[PDB]
């Protein structure tokens, strides 16, 4: 499926997870940010690449990136 990569510039604001319509991201404990939270993608096989997480990222550039490629039944959003 698609590739979801999260960098260290994330501030743990949990906006990307709330904007996710397929429950791909998660919040794990961290020490590199003030909020002590870091975004993770343990369910990247269910991500369709809608880039809704990138819209909700408040940091400049993007702390979360979605790269398309190798579309599957789950990645193409097919009910059939």
């Amino acid at each position: 499926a698609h590739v979801v990569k999260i960098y260290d510039t994330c501030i743990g604001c949990t906006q990307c997870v709330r904007a996710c319509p397929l429950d791909v991201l998660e919040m794990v404990p961290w020490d590199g940010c003030k909020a002590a939270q870091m975004a993770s993608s343990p369910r990247t096989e269910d991500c369709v690449g809608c880039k809704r997480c990138e819209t909700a990222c408040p940091t400049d550039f993007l702390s979360v990136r979605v790269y398309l490629g190798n579309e599957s039944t789950r990645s193409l959003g097919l009910a059939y």
Partner: protein, 73 residues
């Protein structure tokens, strides 16, 4: 009239050149997409974020320059 149509030809060539060199120079990165090299040459968009990012690849610049080249020829 030949003078006017020659200047029209010059306009077409310069505009197609502008589109193609903007696609080539901003191919690996831009301000809307600094990481345009990681997304390959032909990718659709980055979504509706940052105001909208459709037709941002160099392939889309080439595909608009095809229209401009067709008009010039």
């Amino acid at each position: 009239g030949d003078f006017l149509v020659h200047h029209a030809i010059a306009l077409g060539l310069h505009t197609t050149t502008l589109i193609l060199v903007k696609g080539a120079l901003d191919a690996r990165g831009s301000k809307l997409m600094p990481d345009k090299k990681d997304f390959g040459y032909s990718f659709p968009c980055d979504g509706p974020g940052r105001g909208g990012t459709c037709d941002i690849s160099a392939y889309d610049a080439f595909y608009l320059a095809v229209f401009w080249m067709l008009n010039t020829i």
